[PDB]
Amino acid sequence: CPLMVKVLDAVRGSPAINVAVHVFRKAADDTWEPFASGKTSESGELHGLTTEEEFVEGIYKVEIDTKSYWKALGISPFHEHAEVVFTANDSGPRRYTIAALLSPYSYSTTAVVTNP
Amino acid sequence: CPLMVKVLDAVRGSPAINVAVHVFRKAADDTWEPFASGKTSESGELHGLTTEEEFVEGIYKVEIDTKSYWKALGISPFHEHAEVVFTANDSGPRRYTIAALLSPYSYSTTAVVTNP
Amino acid sequence: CPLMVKVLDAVRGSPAINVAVHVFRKAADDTWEPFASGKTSESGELHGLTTEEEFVEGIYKVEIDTKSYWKALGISPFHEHAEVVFTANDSGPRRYTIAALLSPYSYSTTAVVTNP
Amino acid sequence: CPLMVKVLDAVRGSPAINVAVHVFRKAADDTWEPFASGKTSESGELHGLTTEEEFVEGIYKVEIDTKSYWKALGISPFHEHAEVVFTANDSGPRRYTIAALLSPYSYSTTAVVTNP
Ligand SMILES: OB(O)c1ccc(/C=C/c2cc(O)cc(O)c2)c(Cl)c1
Ligand SMILES: OB(O)c1ccc(/C=C/c2cc(O)cc(O)c2)c(Cl)c1
């Protein structure tokens, strides 16, 4: 797929499983249109959010529901969620992996952008 | 200073200087109302955004114009901006420092929540 | 394999390719014995460092040559290398992924520990 | 203060208090000679490690006893310690802050290098 999301847990040393993820795309009217959604697998990965034909040039926001994830482990986390906003495919079609590493009061995110 | 924002540059190994920073607070209609903003100092810090009386419980968003920072340095930046969304809670006397460490394709953020 | 190393580049938004990696194991005499070595592939991954029979209980140090990596891109980085030191398999045999995310003046590392 | 060390807790969202910190300097025989050490304050900071005259160019190692920190909080910590290895260079008047952000299975570190 042209878009994949990977989530890691820095407290447990494991993939972040069952993490809800929502993708929005900025519409012409400048509002965030819902584009795709899903949940991470046993390996902390989310595959199949979209296809090459559907994943056109645009501004995208990937929202990772970190709060729900931590609450289900008894932790009262700082953030509501992690948000990643970026322009996609404005220099031709590429493959995007959005990775996040999660702690209760901190997170980091990076992007791996590759051209097939 | 119940809220401070500090921004660092992981490429140059320096404070992120003259970075635009916006704080929004979610309203009743769940809209993002502008709350405070400014530009980071020579120390990469932004103080005096708000006061203890004005900084009530609620949901807050800190938005960092990372795109403009990297452009001014001539790196092609991946993110449109860096966004940090959290709930301010009154559980005792608290002060919040929102730190962000910036790279062209990644950022990390942490909250340092302390009792004065 | 029971030990894999993954390295990402936060400046370029890509896997960190051709990164030299050395693994040491603390010997009885309390010196660091050379245990395994290798280089990351096109995907930023290093496979085949060791086997289940060889990867016994111990204290291990994984040294990632970050300086050589950046120098070959014209960057004069802060760190000599990234070092990850940890006790392995003292609670039974497990699989270890050591991940690093690299910037010129910063890096982060995490561990994904799974039980097959 | 040409060298400061600051340590933060990504789980509790707080300064890492009373953390042991050791600084070593590589000798001619390429041995790690003890150079300075101490314990972080209530602010997670360690000042007065050295002086401008004593802090000559060379290779330095900052070692943080993260294992003992997490044990005191009852989390099973992955790393034996966190280590940061860098070359101090005289290219102009410089001051170094070595920051580390700690999780049980991960840490990130950055250098803030500034001209007084
Ligand atoms: O295919 B795999 O086995 C795999 C393993 C680990 C990662 C980790 C990515 C990462 C993101 C951060 O913000 C900080 C950090 O230290 C690591 C990834 Cl993308 C893939
Ligand atoms: O004195 B202060 O007000 C202060 C507060 C916070 C930091 C450091 C923040 C930091 C954040 C990350 O997401 C990764 C990382 O390695 C470091 C520093 Cl240096 C200083």
| CB neighbour list of residue B115: distance below 8 Å, 6 or more residues apart | B92, B93, B94, B95
Q: State how far the alpha carbon of C23 is from the alpha carbons of B27, B67, C35, D7, D79, in Å.
A: 53, 38, 5, 26, 15
B113 CB under 6 A from ligand 2? no
Are C108 and D106 in contact (CB < 8 Å)?
yes
Distance CA C55, CA A87 (A): 44
Nearest-ligand number for the alpha carbon of C4 = 1
Please tell me the distance from the alpha carbon of residue B72 to that of residue B91, in angstroms, as a whole number.
Answer: 41
Question: Reported resolution in A?
Answer: 1.9
* Pair C83, A83: CB distance under 8 Å: no
**Which residue has tokens 């795109």?**
B67
Which residue has 């101090």 as its token pair? D88
Residues D107, D80 contacting (CB under 8 angstroms): no
Tokens of C97: 């992924």
* Cβ under 8 Å to B: C residues 4-43: 9-13
A67: three-class secondary structure by DSSP: helix
CB C20 within 8 A of CB C65: yes
B40's tokens: 């980071």
Question: How far is residue B12's CA from residue B18's CA, in Å, rounded to a whole number?
Answer: 15
Buried b (16+ CB within 10 A) or exposed e, B55-73: beeeebbbbbbbbebbeee
DSSP 8-state code for residue D62: E
Q: Are A55 and A23 in contact (CB under 8 A)?
A: no
What spacing in Å lies between the alpha carbon of C48 and ligand 1's midpoint? 19
Asked if C116 reaches chain A (Cβ–Cβ under 8 Å), the answer is: no
Q: Quick one: tokens of D14?
A: 């707080």
Tokens for D4?
């400061």
D108 touching A (Cβ < 8 Å): yes
D98: which residues sit within 8 A by CB, 6+ positions away? D3, D4, D5, D6, D62, D84, D86, D109, D111
d(CA D60, CA C78): 11
For residue D40, the surrounding DSSP H or E stretch is none
Locus of tokens 């910036």: B102
Rounded distance between C-alpha atoms, residue C86 and residue D77, angstroms: 9
Residues 6+ apart with CB under 8 A from D19: D7, D39, D40, D44, D64, D65, D66, D68, D69
Experimental approach was X-ray
